[PDB]
Amino acid sequence: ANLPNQVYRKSVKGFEFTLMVVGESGLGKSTLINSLFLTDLYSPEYPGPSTVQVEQSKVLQLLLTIVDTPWQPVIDYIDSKFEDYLNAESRNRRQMPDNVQCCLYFIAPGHGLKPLDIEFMKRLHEKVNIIPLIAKADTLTPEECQQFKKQIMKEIQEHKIKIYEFPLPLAVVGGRQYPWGVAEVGEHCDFTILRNMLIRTHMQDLKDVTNNVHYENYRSRKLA
Amino acid sequence: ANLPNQVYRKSVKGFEFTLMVVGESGLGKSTLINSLFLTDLYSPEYPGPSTVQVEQSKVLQLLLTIVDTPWQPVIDYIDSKFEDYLNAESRNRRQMPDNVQCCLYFIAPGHGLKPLDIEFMKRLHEKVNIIPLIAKADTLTPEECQQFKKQIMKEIQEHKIKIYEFPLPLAVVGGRQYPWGVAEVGEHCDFTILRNMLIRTHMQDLKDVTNNVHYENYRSRKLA
Amino acid sequence: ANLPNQVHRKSVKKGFEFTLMVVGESGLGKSTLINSLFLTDLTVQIEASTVEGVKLRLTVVDKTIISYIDEQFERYLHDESGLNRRIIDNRVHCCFYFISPFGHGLKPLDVAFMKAIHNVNIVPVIAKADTLTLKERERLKKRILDEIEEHIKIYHLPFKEQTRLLKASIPFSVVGSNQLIVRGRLYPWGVVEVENPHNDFLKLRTMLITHMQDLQEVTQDLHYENFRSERL
Amino acid sequence: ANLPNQVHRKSVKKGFEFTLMVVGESGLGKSTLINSLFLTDLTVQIEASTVEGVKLRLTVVDKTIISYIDEQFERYLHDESGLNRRIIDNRVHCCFYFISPFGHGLKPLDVAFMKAIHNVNIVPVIAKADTLTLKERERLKKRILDEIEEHIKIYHLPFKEQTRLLKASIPFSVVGSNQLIVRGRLYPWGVVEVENPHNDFLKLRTMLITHMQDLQEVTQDLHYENFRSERL
Amino acid sequence: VPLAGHVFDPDQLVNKSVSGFCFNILCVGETGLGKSTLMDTLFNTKFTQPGVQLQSNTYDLQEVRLKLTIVSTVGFGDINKEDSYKPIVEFIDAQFEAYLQEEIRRVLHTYHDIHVCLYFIAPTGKSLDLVTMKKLDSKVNIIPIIAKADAISKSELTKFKIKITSELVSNGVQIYQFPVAEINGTMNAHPFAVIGNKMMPWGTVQHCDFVKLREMLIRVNMEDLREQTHTRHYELYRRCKLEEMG
Amino acid sequence: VPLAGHVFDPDQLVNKSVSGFCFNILCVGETGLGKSTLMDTLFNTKFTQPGVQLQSNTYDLQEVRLKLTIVSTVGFGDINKEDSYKPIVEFIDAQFEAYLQEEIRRVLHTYHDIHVCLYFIAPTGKSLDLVTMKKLDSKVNIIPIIAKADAISKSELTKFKIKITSELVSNGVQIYQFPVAEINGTMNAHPFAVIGNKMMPWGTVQHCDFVKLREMLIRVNMEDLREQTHTRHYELYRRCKLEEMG
Ligand SMILES: Nc1nc2c(ncn2[C@@H]2O[C@H](COP(=O)(O)OP(=O)(O)OP(=O)(O)O)[C@@H](O)[C@H]2O)c(=O)[nH]1
Ligand SMILES: Nc1nc2c(ncn2[C@@H]2O[C@H](COP(=O)(O)OP(=O)(O)OP(=O)(O)O)[C@@H](O)[C@H]2O)c(=O)[nH]1
Ligand SMILES: Nc1nc2c(ncn2[C@@H]2O[C@H](COP(=O)(O)OP(=O)(O)O)[C@@H](O)[C@H]2O)c(=O)[nH]1
Ligand SMILES: Nc1nc2c(ncn2[C@@H]2O[C@H](COP(=O)(O)OP(=O)(O)O)[C@@H](O)[C@H]2O)c(=O)[nH]1
Ligand SMILES: Nc1nc2c(ncn2[C@@H]2O[C@H](COP(=O)(O)OP(=O)(O)O)[C@@H](O)[C@H]2O)c(=O)[nH]1
């Protein structure tokens, strides 16, 4: 009797992950890229009509892909991600990456749910796991923060979009400080939550279901 | 080594013997029969014209035969003795007696030899052994006895008759005694001589030659 | 009277001859065991060699083989008629046959060897039971024995107990060293002796010397009737 | 190794058989001698009887006889071809032959007996030499021996001196008592012993036990060639 | 590329607690070198006639837990059992989970998906095994093992291990070993060989080459052969077979 | 008759000094029971091949003296020697002195005129002799004698003498004995049997039935058989033969 599967962790040796942002890009997606990641790359978010996607693997190493591009194209980007590699599946095929597709999407005001916020999510629902947050959220009094929380979640319960979960939403403080007072990360910001549950502690599920749901979305679909 | 032949004398158990007298019978043949023999038989010498022959065996036993009969007949008696028994010889014949033929003959005077004394001897010569004696020989002065001794022996040497011998002659005193003197047996008489050499001491030869000479006289004769 | 005395010395000039013919799964020290049964040494091959004294004609397997025995029960019986005689047999004075040490029952191969071989003269045997426990050892003794039983003919062993003892542990399990330390097999776990029980090595050494009178059966039994099948 | 031991006991079950066939001028205590050679007792006749142990088939003369041996070398060799075997021989394991004690040379009768008998197995012998002096005894030993010589075949006797001694006084002169006072013959002139020398009685008693392996010649020699004359 | 930028907050540990967890071992070997006696002795608990027969079990274990098929399987003698039997399981185990996986997915539901064979050879001084192991060169995951270890001296385990190795490569076969790896890498080369109750000839029974096969085989390099097995025999299993349909 | 008259002066003694004096003995017997060894031993001084042979001697002795022929004669074996040989001497000895004695006389010149045979028989427990002795029943003077006397015990000389006598009369034969004769007459019946140097098995050699045959045979009844012999065999010899001419 010696049964360890501490083999299983000696094992990776990698682990790797693709991680999608939509947004209105004035305000702190490219912060949450470099800040969620505690890290500095420049020159990621400026576009022509109409999309911008960096992989890095750094180490401690992940391939952390973020895509972030400023309906159809990120749909038809991401199936054509998705049909690519389970096109690799049918082949003699040697062991090719890469697969996570989930959203980090902003829409961030605030009083209601943002009309293209509405649409972007609805269709996209299947094709990754959607995590939505709320940005520049020193924007809001939180007695006011009460409102965007309730009204959008009511919002999506009504217009009936799926998200992620793992077993709110998540309001994203771009720490950083002002003329009168400084605002922290938090708590303060509920932006630790999106570090804790995003970062290490449910990260596996969102790829595995990313791979599992909408891989088998995309081919159990197109096998028909 | 034990070689005796004192068997040979245990043997006879008889012995037997035939013993012939001629004579002028006045004078003491029948004395010399009974006296030579120291013995008494009567009635032996009286005859008719012309023979008298006794056997006895007495014992101490011989068959002592004397013949005494008063030329041809005593010749033709004695061959017909002699041819009888070697007529027995030729026969299967069982052991028959009897055979001695020798003479005791007297002729007894004395001065010369007695003419029929002469003849009796001459022919008879072969056919027994002849012993001659001289009888009543108290008859003679022996200075005179000298004469009959010499003249007869000369006598027979001349007229050439055979006798016996065994290796004189023999003058036969019929003891007996006279008016003046007695005459003895002897010596005295030379009549012991005729006891000694007659009786025991040459007796065997005279039979054996009697048997041998004139047996083989009588048949070696008549075998021719 | 005496003649057992003057019988006895009489092999003194003459004695004696064994041929035996080994089969068994090579493997398991037929030739290592034999030499130390023998205190000497070495599709078939042949062994003739001699010692203080006796002659060995002794054949190893390395069923072509049933020719060669009846080739030999031929040549026996060729000369026996009979004209002329010095002369020889290579008769199979016995055979051995060797099951495994391990893994249990007795082998279909052993069976149909052991059926059709059997007129000559088997001692079946077990090599290398310093594999085998006495709890294993006895286990194969009998289920061999019964295996004999659904069937058989190896040779039933014609001093009261010296016989009646050897026979009831048939069959007997045996390791030849010819190495030593007292012969003679080497374990750093532990050490393993010849000629003890321990080892049923000597039951066979001492049995098979004792009788050698498959001399006598092989001569009465197996060639008499190889006349009596084969003439007749 | 050992087998002379286990050879030895092996006649223990089985041992052993002698037939011998007596000739000799009756006369001279063939049957009185044999019994005391045997410590037991009795135109030919037959003797089969047994003792602590061994079997006797033993034929006396009382030349018709040369049928009966080759009648027996027949019946040996009838069965040997060979079908079937329990079974028996009456082979002539030896014969004896007996010259006189007295009067000198060896008899024309003995000769032409002893010539034409000779494939089987004689011991010639002398009975009743408490007739005979040692000055007589030796006298017949040799002029017998030479008489053998102008010729012959009786059996030349295949413990160093125990052999080489017995053999040089061949042949040996012998009286059986079975009476006694210590066996066992009675003289008022003097007394006469068995088993001394004295008597060469025991040379034969002890010789003829010793070897009994006309067993072996009669079987090798006389019937082998009675095949080899008679088959061929 | 240069993903090489500079920076606080495991993901590997996450896929640890991907706790459900499965394995197949098959031994093949003659009736009866203790393949079963191997298996209970390995996991310390209890589990001659004609033609090629394979025998089927699976059982389950703890400390945090795992669901494990063991087969062993048996063979004897008069001699092409060995092409036939293991293609029985192994190909056809092995096309199967292809064959789920052509079609609906992913239910995390197999063993013989084949994972290891021990071929156990026996010990002394062979040919049925050579073809058995070269025909079973195919593979499944074949680890190479020597039975009733208390039949040899150590002077012969010197001798018969390191001869029987030449054999592996004489006609050379595929094998297993592992690539870290001093002690993974010592122990592959260290042909291995294998031996009851306590406590603590005349035979007293355990040091012995029992553990070495215990601790690598069962402890250490542990799913490497799981993924070799899904890498290898899924892989020649489909690619040959897709060679053959397509 | 009665020659029986009464009376001084041997004649028997006269024919004693018939001193010249003669005898023949023959023994017949197999080669070689000591017939010669008998003869010198009797008179104490020295004298296997085919057909019947008779051997001839004569010699002379003293103390007062005597001229004595001894023959002995020999025989053996493959069996009508015995009719032939002794008719050789004995008839033809015996007609001879007839044949002088037909013709001239009386020369006192013979032996074999045949006088005695000893037939010597030998000793133990026979047929050649029976016909030999009954054919030689004829006779000459046959005295009946048993050789190498030191071959028997006295318990057997009891036994074999007095059995072998029954034999003499079984087919009964003519014999000798004598008729005086207590001691002549004891000794005839007392089949007799017979044994060297001095002085005074392991054998020391003389009491023994040697003398008895010495002293009667040679001492005592001594010419009885001389005259029996001239009575008997002259007598059947001529009377048969004169039967035959005349
Ligand atoms: N001395 C010794 N005995 C052993 C050894 N290994 C196994 N055995 C014995 O051999 C027997 C093996 O029987 P199993 O355990 O049924 O072997 P198996 O592989 O199941 O055989 P099959 O069922 O026929 O395929 C056991 O009873 C053990 O007692 C060993 O290494 N040394
Ligand atoms: N022990 C013993 N030996 C005897 C006896 N009688 C004779 N012998 C021996 O036997 C031998 C007899 O030989 P011969 O004296 O020549 O006998 P034979 O009658 O002349 O024999 P042939 O000349 O052949 O007719 C002698 O040498 C004696 O030693 C006897 O009574 N006892
Ligand atoms: N006051 C305040 N400013 C922020 C916060 N987050 C981001 N910003 C600023 O607003 C800008 C948002 O643009 P950016 O993060 O680059 O998003 P992009 O347009 O997609 O590149 C950044 O330049 C930040 O300097 C926040 O929480 N509070
Ligand atoms: N004087 C004498 N007388 C004798 C002598 N011899 C015999 N006589 C007698 O003479 C007689 C002779 O006759 P005798 O003898 O009878 O012979 P015979 O005639 O033949 O009978 C006898 O009677 C005698 O008495 C003798 O010597 N002297
Ligand atoms: N421990 C042990 N080893 C054995 C025994 N018998 C044989 N062996 C080993 O097995 C080998 C026998 O090989 P070999 O005699 O050539 O096999 P064979 O040709 O079938 O006789 C030897 O090297 C021994 O080391 C045994 O009883 N005990």
Ligand SMILES: Nc1nc2c(ncn2[C@@H]2O[C@H](COP(=O)(O)OP(=O)(O)O)[C@@H](O)[C@H]2O)c(=O)[nH]1
């Ligand atoms: N003194 C003596 N007598 C013997 C000897 N051998 C035999 N005898 C005698 O001879 C007789 C033998 O007769 P028997 O055995 O019937 O003769 P077979 O039929 O020829 O054997 C016995 O009665 C013995 O008394 C011997 O060596 N010495």
